[PDB]
Amino acid sequence: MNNPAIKRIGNHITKSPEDKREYRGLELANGIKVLLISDPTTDKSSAALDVHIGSLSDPPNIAGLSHFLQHMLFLGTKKYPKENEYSQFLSEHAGSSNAFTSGEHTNYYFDVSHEHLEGALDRFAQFFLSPLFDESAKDREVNAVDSEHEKNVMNDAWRLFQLEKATGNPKHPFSKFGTGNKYTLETRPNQEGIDVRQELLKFHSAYYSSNLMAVVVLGRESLDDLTNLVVKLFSEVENKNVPLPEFPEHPFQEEHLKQLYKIVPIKDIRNLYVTFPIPDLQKYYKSNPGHYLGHLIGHEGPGSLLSELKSKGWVNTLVGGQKEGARGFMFFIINVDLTEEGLLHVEDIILHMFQYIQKLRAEGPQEWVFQELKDLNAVAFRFKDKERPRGYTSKIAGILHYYPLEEVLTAEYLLEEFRPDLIEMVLDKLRPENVRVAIVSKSFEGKTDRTEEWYGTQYKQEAIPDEVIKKWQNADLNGKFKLPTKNEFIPTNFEILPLEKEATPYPALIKDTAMSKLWFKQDDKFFLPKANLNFEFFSPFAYVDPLHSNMAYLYLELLKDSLNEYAYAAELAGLSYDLQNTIYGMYLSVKGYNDKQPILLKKIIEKMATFEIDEKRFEIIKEAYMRSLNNFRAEQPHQHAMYYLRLLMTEVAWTKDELKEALDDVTLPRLKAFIPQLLSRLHIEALLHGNITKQAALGIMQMVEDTLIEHAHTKPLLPSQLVRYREVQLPDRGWFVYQQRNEVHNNSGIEIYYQTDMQSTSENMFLELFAQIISEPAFNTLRTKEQLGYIVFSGPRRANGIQGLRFIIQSEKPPHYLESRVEAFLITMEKSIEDMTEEAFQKHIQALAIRRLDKPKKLSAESAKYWGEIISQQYNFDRDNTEVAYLKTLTKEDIIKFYKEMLAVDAPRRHKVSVHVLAREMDSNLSQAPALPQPEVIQNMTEFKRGLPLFPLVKPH
Ligand SMILES: COC(=O)[C@H](Cc1cnc[nH]1)NC(=O)CN(CCc1ccccc1)CC(=O)O
Ligand SMILES: [Zn+2]
């Protein structure tokens, strides 16, 4: 019978009957809540742990101490003391790992190839028993956290997030600064005689208690096997018995209500943030009052709040509902963006907001609205897509802290109790008497008197004038507002059509005309009543010039905007659509339950081909678009660097500058005329994949075609017109540099690309294995050791069927410097491939192998792979076996010669391009950096491209 180490074993853990995985929860004797997941099919295994502490519990005098502790647990324990044993064990077993710190949680998670769960899990458990917090590790890692912060500093969503905490009761833990930085984590602690290693030990020791812990483990093993496992490694975690922190006081007290903030953004954006404090509804999770209201306020359908603000040309988008706080407090929000006009009618927008809330009081709670939500959640739950295991374990570790073992799977889905009282109760808190208002606009530039300490946000604070409050308190009904009616998009037909006699393991080309290639597969794997239908429409007029490119965009935005009201129902019924312009024309994906898919598709194509612009909206979207083109100048440095490289290496690319200038030439008449033009000749390549038949698929594709013919007069396009763009071919021994300044951010950015050959079976596996071998050593040398940045990335590049190696770093140090530390790195690397065992080398193959052979867990992931094969026009649907088969063949020498031919500093075929993005402010013991040739500075994009060969395109299959 009984077991000393276990306190209890829960009953049946309720699951979806479609979910084949097996489950067992339990609580150890030390009080760790643990959920076990058995999946005999799984390629990777995963575990995650979540501690119920986070930054809300930092010592007041060392801000960011948990985010810091989180970074430090990866860096050596007593039992596995080598600084990077954890990240290197994973790299070599096809695993990865991350962690995050929120106000009340620290969540640690990883996956690994299924054969090394134990390996991975043992090294993992150590974090929670005896981390070393190595003194020189602490010294180094403090930079990476400073860097986490630098990137967030000029980011308008982080600033807002912290500024909110800075305008509530500063006495409250909510007002803490949870990232931390160099200043707060070493400089100041040094100044104040604080011994940080000790403070870290103390905190670990105080809060990392077993009672406050939840663990999830998903492996190939039996439930009995997993039980013994988790018991073995986790029972020695000590029970220091800490009470869980509570925060029953809202941090927004009287003095903090009826306030208005005027805030300057970094980007040119206008939004209005309306927020009421409310209690913590978490306990009401079985009826879920704030969800019911969120559904209603946030609704986008006919009759809705957004409908009206949108008609009045005041706001373009709206979000509303409950927003988490911590144990003891929540918020209820309603935030909109703001048109130019909208910015001058903020008071009116808030009235409308209250008129709408009034309409809800007048109408009472609605059992049918609650039923609808409920029915959707039961359908959603039953046919949920099966999840990637790392994400799943991370997620359930969190909610193990909120729900009885048995409801952990279903808690966030199944609604059970109708509560008109709670609905009323929450409604009665959404009142002008206790509202806070924030306006974010460039107009407040110059006229603010305040500054946020951490990010440096300029703002102004005021009381809402008392007659403004009254004016809102007296919100009449407004007849422009209605509740939503019954949702017609709700699926009722869930039948999984039987697998057909001619069904195929990969998509089959089942139609091949001048108008359209239709690739097709009935689903042989997941069996949920869902499908993905993907179309590429080709027109050469979508990207012919900058103006045409602008026009394609606008047109597709306006169509989406026109369709929103109608599409929205569909979206809540789990039928969604994506639609955007490409450098080849347009892309249209429709995913979800297949039951009403045909209807939604039809409406989209019908709308596309019969489109009637409305002057007023065109004017608003044009203006939004201009701004976002401008706002690019405020993306982080490494994004700039990637953007430039794309511009540099493609045959044809229209810069942001060129699009911006060309935008003013875009009048309503020119657009009206462009749309029929663009739809007159097309070609469609489509992937239809899911719970659908061959003849359904031909019918759906014909339907699309037939609609465009009937309404657009569309005609086929010629094969010689189906043109793909080529990548620039760099010369042997070549090295070019292109330099720009990031005017917003104070880091610099860099991308370094070593181009290699076209993609091919052998070229692919060379580059890929090289990647794998250097993957974690790069991170470990360039970040952990040399602490060059938070952002440090290396891996294959691929575009236009060509490929190469890239490095991406965001750093405080100049790029000339970044370059050489990579170049030093690359030698450490040849010279340590020489040194490695044959086994180490085979492990690497094996790891890359599992990684590539990892089976899609859900329809759209499989759809993705296929779609990848189709847009690249390689159609190599079984590439994974083929490429893997070949890879198993390679040897330490194969790799060295490849490296020596294409990569080493004095390689005969080194093709290096470097983008240097300099910081706001610049102007233009470690290994050995090789002396580098003087680069050719790229003066002018066009000229440089005029001066070089273009590669071929790759050949199909
Ligand atoms: C569940 O209720 C609803 O249907 C509507 C959806 C909607 C609103 N407007 C169009 N659609 N509500 C939400 O989406 C609410 N949302 C806001 C929380 C939030 C957290 C951190 C930062 C900013 C915002 C919750 C989320 O992010 O899951
Ligand atoms: Zn972090």
How far is Cα 925 from Cα 779, in angstroms, rounded to an integer?
17
388 plus 421 within the same structural domain: yes
**Which of 316, 323, 412 best tests ligand 1's pocket when mutated (most atoms within 8 Å of CB)?**
323
* Residue among 704, 711, 686, 684 at smallest CA distance from 584: 684
Q: Considering all CA atoms of the chain, what is the largest pairwise distance in Å, rounded to the nearest integer?
A: 82
3-class DSSP assignment, residue 817? helix
Q: What is the DSSP string of 731-767?
A: PTTEEEEEEEE-SS-SSEEEEEEEEEEE--HHHHHHH
Atom of ligand 1 nearest to the CA of 295: 4
State in Å: Cα 163 to ligand 1 middle: 20
> Side chain identity at 664, as an amino acid letter?
D
State in Å: Cα 108 to ligand 2 middle: 11
* Residue among 519, 692, 509 at smallest CA distance from 591: 692
* Residue among 222, 341, 221, 359 at smallest CA distance from 272: 341
* Residue among 261, 313, 423 at smallest CA distance from 357: 423
3-class DSSP assignment, residue 252? coil
568 plus 671 within the same structural domain: yes
The tokens describing 790, both together, are 């938070």
Given a contact cutoff of 8 angstroms between Cβ atoms, the answer to whether 610 and 553 are in contact is no
Q: Quick one: CA dihedral 842, 847, 851, 857, positive or negative?
A: positive
* Residue among 332, 335, 356 at smallest CA distance from 346: 335
Given a contact cutoff of 8 angstroms between Cβ atoms, the answer to whether 281 and 323 are in contact is no
Asked, for residue 11, whether it belongs to a domain, the answer is yes
The tokens describing 571, both together, are 């979206």
* Residue among 928, 783, 954 at smallest CA distance from 872: 954
295 plus 257 within the same structural domain: yes
* Residue among 18, 8, 12 at smallest CA distance from 858: 18
Could you say which DSSP state residue 903 is in?
I
Supply the residue whose CA is at minimum distance from atom 1 of ligand 1. Answer: 291
Q: Which ligand is nearest to the CA of 325?
A: 1
Asked, for residue 647, whether it belongs to a domain, the answer is yes
Given a contact cutoff of 8 angstroms between Cβ atoms, the answer to whether 645 and 915 are in contact is yes
Other Cβ atoms within 10 Å of 372 Cβ, number: 18
The tokens describing 820, both together, are 């050489």
> Side chain identity at 566, as an amino acid letter?
Y
Rounded to 5 degrees, φ, ψ at 617 are -75, -45
Q: Is residue 612 exposed (0-12), middle (13-18) or buried (19+ Cβ within 10 Å)?
A: exposed
Instruction: Give bridge partners of residue 803 from the DSSP assignment.
Output: 798
b/e map 905-922, b = 16+ CB within 10 Å: eebebbbbbbbbbbbeee
Sheet holding 683-690, edge to edge: 508-512, 516-522, 683-690, 530-538, 585-593, 575-582
Q: Which ligand is nearest to the CA of 180?
A: 2
State in Å: Cα 706 to ligand 2 middle: 52
Atom of ligand 1 nearest to the CA of 161: 22
How far is Cα 382 from Cα 19, in angstroms, rounded to an integer?
8
3-class DSSP assignment, residue 257? coil
Q: Are strands 271-278 and 329-337 parallel, antiparallel or unpaired?
A: antiparallel
| Number of H-type helices and E-type strands within the chain | 30, 26
Given a contact cutoff of 8 angstroms between Cβ atoms, the answer to whether 428 and 251 are in contact is no
Spatial CB neighbours of 198, under 8 Å, sequence gap ≥ 6:
none
The tokens describing 827, both together, are 């030698």
Asked, for residue 482, whether it belongs to a domain, the answer is no
Q: Which ligand is nearest to the CA of 324?
A: 1
Atom of ligand 1 nearest to the CA of 333: 17
How far is Cα 635 from Cα 79, in angstroms, rounded to an integer?
42
* Residue among 888, 866, 886 at smallest CA distance from 876: 866
**Which of 319, 370, 374 best tests ligand 1's pocket when mutated (most atoms within 8 Å of CB)?**
319
622 plus 712 within the same structural domain: yes
Determine the Cα angle at 142 with ends 137 and 143, to 5°: 110
C-alpha pair distances (Å), 548 with each of 542, 643, 673, 825: 6, 20, 11, 44
CATH number for the domain spanning 117: value is 3.30.830.10
How far is Cα 611 from Cα 530, in angstroms, rounded to an integer?
29
Instruction: Give bridge partners of residue 758 from the DSSP assignment.
Output: 802
Q: What is the DSSP string of 24-64?
A: EEEEETT--EEEEEE-TT-SEEEEEEEES--GGGS-TTSTT
- The H-or-E segment that residue 319 falls in is strand 318-326
Q: Is residue 136 exposed (0-12), middle (13-18) or buried (19+ Cβ within 10 Å)?
A: exposed
How far is Cα 455 from Cα 837, in angstroms, rounded to an integer?
49
3-class DSSP assignment, residue 861? helix
How far is Cα 181 from Cα 177, in angstroms, rounded to an integer?
10
Number of folded domains that form the chain: 4
How far is Cα 846 from Cα 93, in angstroms, rounded to an integer?
8
> Side chain identity at 28, as an amino acid letter?
L
How far is Cα 861 from Cα 366, in angstroms, rounded to an integer?
38
How far is Cα 292 from Cα 309, in angstroms, rounded to an integer?
21
> Side chain identity at 570, as an amino acid letter?
A
Given a contact cutoff of 8 angstroms between Cβ atoms, the answer to whether 561 and 621 are in contact is yes
Residue list, ligand 1 pocket, CB within 6 Å: 291, 294-295, 298, 300, 318-321, 323
Q: What is the DSSP string of 635-660?
A: S-HHHHHHHHHHHHHBSS---HHHHH
How far is Cα 274 from Cα 336, in angstroms, rounded to an integer?
9
- The H-or-E segment that residue 274 falls in is strand 271-278
* Residue among 246, 620, 217, 523 at smallest CA distance from 400: 217
Atom of ligand 1 nearest to the CA of 320: 8
3-class DSSP assignment, residue 278? strand
Given a contact cutoff of 8 angstroms between Cβ atoms, the answer to whether 520 and 689 are in contact is yes
417 plus 350 within the same structural domain: yes
Q: Is residue 205 exposed (0-12), middle (13-18) or buried (19+ Cβ within 10 Å)?
A: exposed
* Residue among 859, 876, 847 at smallest CA distance from 769: 847
* Residue among 178, 183, 174 at smallest CA distance from 158: 178
- The H-or-E segment that residue 860 falls in is helix 859-871
Given a contact cutoff of 8 angstroms between Cβ atoms, the answer to whether 902 and 733 are in contact is no
Among 474, 489, 513, residue at a domain's last position: 474
* Residue among 838, 516, 581, 547 at smallest CA distance from 665: 547
Spatial CB neighbours of 329, under 8 Å, sequence gap ≥ 6:
174, 247, 248, 249, 250, 251, 277, 278, 279, 280
The tokens describing 590, both together, are 């429709």
Other Cβ atoms within 10 Å of 715 Cβ, number: 12
- The H-or-E segment that residue 119 falls in is helix 117-125
Among 705, 727, 749, residue at a domain's last position: 727
* Residue among 757, 693, 685, 263 at smallest CA distance from 521: 693
Other Cβ atoms within 10 Å of 864 Cβ, number: 15
**Cα pseudo-dihedral 878, 884, 887, 889, rounded to 10:** -100
Resolution in A: 2.8
Q: What is the DSSP string of 355-403?
A: HHHHHHHHH---HHHHHHHHHHHHHHHHTPPPPPHHHHHHHHHHHTTTS
Elucidated via: X-ray
- The H-or-E segment that residue 88 falls in is helix 85-91
How far is Cα 739 from Cα 637, in angstroms, rounded to an integer?
12
Asked, for residue 481, whether it belongs to a domain, the answer is no
State in Å: Cα 647 to ligand 1 middle: 36
Please report where in the chains the tokens 């020695």 appear, as a residue: 236
Could you say which DSSP state residue 840 is in?
H
The tokens describing 511, both together, are 């139609």
702 plus 683 within the same structural domain: yes
Among 669, 697, 727, residue at a domain's last position: 727
E strand segments, 864-954: 911-918, 936-937
Asked, for residue 444, whether it belongs to a domain, the answer is yes
State in Å: Cα 98 to ligand 2 middle: 9
Asked, for residue 77, whether it belongs to a domain, the answer is yes
State in Å: Cα 791 to ligand 2 middle: 11
| Structural domain harbouring 223 | 1-244
230 plus 264 within the same structural domain: no
Given a contact cutoff of 8 angstroms between Cβ atoms, the answer to whether 64 and 58 are in contact is yes
* First vs last C-alpha separation in the chain: 61
Q: How many CA atoms lie within 13 A of 458 on its CB side?
A: 12
Supply the residue whose CA is at minimum distance from atom 6 of ligand 1. Answer: 298
Other Cβ atoms within 10 Å of 192 Cβ, number: 9
Q: Residue 643: left (phi > 0), alpha (psi -120 to 50), or beta?
A: alpha
Instruction: Give bridge partners of residue 748 from the DSSP assignment.
Output: 811
State in Å: Cα 399 to ligand 1 middle: 19
554 plus 681 within the same structural domain: yes
> Side chain identity at 797, as an amino acid letter?
R
645 plus 564 within the same structural domain: yes
The tokens describing 520, both together, are 């097709």
Given a contact cutoff of 8 angstroms between Cβ atoms, the answer to whether 797 and 806 are in contact is yes
3-class DSSP assignment, residue 192? coil
706 plus 741 within the same structural domain: no
Given a contact cutoff of 8 angstroms between Cβ atoms, the answer to whether 912 and 737 are in contact is no
b/e map 236-265, b = 16+ CB within 10 Å: ebeeeebeebebeebbbeeebbbbbbbbbb
Q: Residue 373: left (phi > 0), alpha (psi -120 to 50), or beta?
A: alpha
> Side chain identity at 840, as an amino acid letter?
A
Question: For the chain, how big is the Rg over CA atoms in Å?
Answer: 29
* Residue among 597, 624, 601, 613 at smallest CA distance from 559: 613
How far is Cα 303 from Cα 480, in angstroms, rounded to an integer?
7
Sheet holding 44-51, edge to edge: 6-9, 22-28, 33-38, 213-219, 44-51, 105-113, 96-102
Given a contact cutoff of 8 angstroms between Cβ atoms, the answer to whether 611 and 688 are in contact is no
Rounded to 5 degrees, φ, ψ at 871 are -80, -30
Given a contact cutoff of 8 angstroms between Cβ atoms, the answer to whether 152 and 810 are in contact is no
Rounded to 5 degrees, φ, ψ at 571 are -60, -50
Count the residues in the chain. Answer: 957
Given a contact cutoff of 8 angstroms between Cβ atoms, the answer to whether 717 and 764 are in contact is no
Please report where in the chains the tokens 């009470």 appear, as a residue: 243
Write a three-state SS string for 784-795.
Answer: HHCCCCCCEEEE
**Cα pseudo-dihedral 628, 630, 635, 637, rounded to 10:** 150
Atom of ligand 1 nearest to the CA of 572: 4
152 plus 223 within the same structural domain: yes
715 plus 752 within the same structural domain: no
Spatial CB neighbours of 781, under 8 Å, sequence gap ≥ 6:
825, 828
Asked, for residue 86, whether it belongs to a domain, the answer is yes
Q: What is the DSSP string of 560-580?
A: HHHHHHHHHHHHHTTEEEEEE
Q: Quick one: CA dihedral 318, 321, 327, 329, positive or negative?
A: positive
The tokens describing 808, both together, are 């991406």
E strand segments, 43-138: 44-51, 96-102, 105-113
The tokens describing 903, both together, are 């990569």
Asked, for residue 492, whether it belongs to a domain, the answer is no
